[PDB]
A paper describes a structure:
[name] is a type II transmembrane protein of 274 residues that localizes to late endosomes and lysosomes. The [name] folds shared a similar five-layered ordered core comprising residues S120–G254 and contained 17 β-strands, each ranging between 3 and 15 residues. We observed three [name] folds, with no clear relationships between folds and diseases.
In fold II, these internal cavities are smaller than in fold I. We observed two subtypes of fold II (IIa and [name]) that differed mainly by the conformation of segment A167–I187.
Residue numbers in the entry:
A (entry chain B), B (entry chain A), C (entry chain C): 120 to 254
The structure:
Amino acid sequence: SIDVKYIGVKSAYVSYDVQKRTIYLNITNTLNITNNNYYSVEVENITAQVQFSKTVIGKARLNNITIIGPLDMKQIDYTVPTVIAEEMSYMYDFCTLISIKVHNIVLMMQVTVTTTYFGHSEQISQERYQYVDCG
Amino acid sequence: SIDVKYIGVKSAYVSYDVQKRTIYLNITNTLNITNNNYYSVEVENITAQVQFSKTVIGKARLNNITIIGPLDMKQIDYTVPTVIAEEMSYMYDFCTLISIKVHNIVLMMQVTVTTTYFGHSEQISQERYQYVDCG
Amino acid sequence: SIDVKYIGVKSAYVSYDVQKRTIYLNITNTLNITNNNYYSVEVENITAQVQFSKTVIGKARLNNITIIGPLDMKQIDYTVPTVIAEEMSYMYDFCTLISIKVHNIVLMMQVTVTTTYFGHSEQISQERYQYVDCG
């Protein structure tokens, strides 16, 4: 929700950082902070109802009948990697990768035939990544 | 929602950063901060109802009836990488990548046949990425 | 929700950091901080009802009836990696990776046929990653 911050080297509220081979003399330095946060987030107030069937069938006749709910047959992230060779050869090579399914992250939150949802859903990734270094 | 910031090297409210081989003399420095935040985000008030079926068939005759819910057969991120060779050969090479399915991040929130949703959904990614370095 | 911060090297409220071969003399330095946080997050008030079926069959006749609920037959992250060769050979090579299925992080929260949900769902990842280093 709030202040989802990525900071690569350094973070401060205040910084007086002094780096290499420097001379830093006779400084007078003062700081008078009021820093106040009244975070009232993600506050909720709910009256809810969820009803998948009401049925009245009285004096009826219902002879042949068939009923089926929601039907799911997805394929997701589906693969058939096929590598066919005869003289598959690797010789004297320095830095070599033969990579046929690789992931850093899979996040999945709600994967469903059905959902009813009255909430708050937050999904976050923060990262630094190198696949190869071989200098 | 609020303040989703990506910063490469440094972040500060105030900074007096002094770098390499510098001379920094006789400075007078004062600071009187008032910084207040009253974040009231993602606050909610809900009255809700969800229903999938109400039926009243009285005195009727239903001889041959068939009923089917929502039907899903999607293919998502589907692949058939086929490599066919004879004398597949790699020799003396320095930095070589054979990559057939590679993913950094896969984020999926709600993947569904049916959904009713009364909330707040957030999906965030913050990255620095290098696939190959071989200098 | 709040302050999902990724910091690579250093984090501070106030910093007076002095690095290599530097001289820091006769400094007068004061600090007067009032820093207050009143986090009132994720406060809730919920009244809810969930029902799957209500039925009244009176005087009815149900001779050949069939009923089926929600149906799931998904395939997710499904693979058939096939590598076929005759003289598969690796010789004198220095840094060789054969990778056929590799995952760093796999997070799945709710994978279901049906779900009703009245809460808060948060899924967070914070990382630094190198797949190969061989300089």
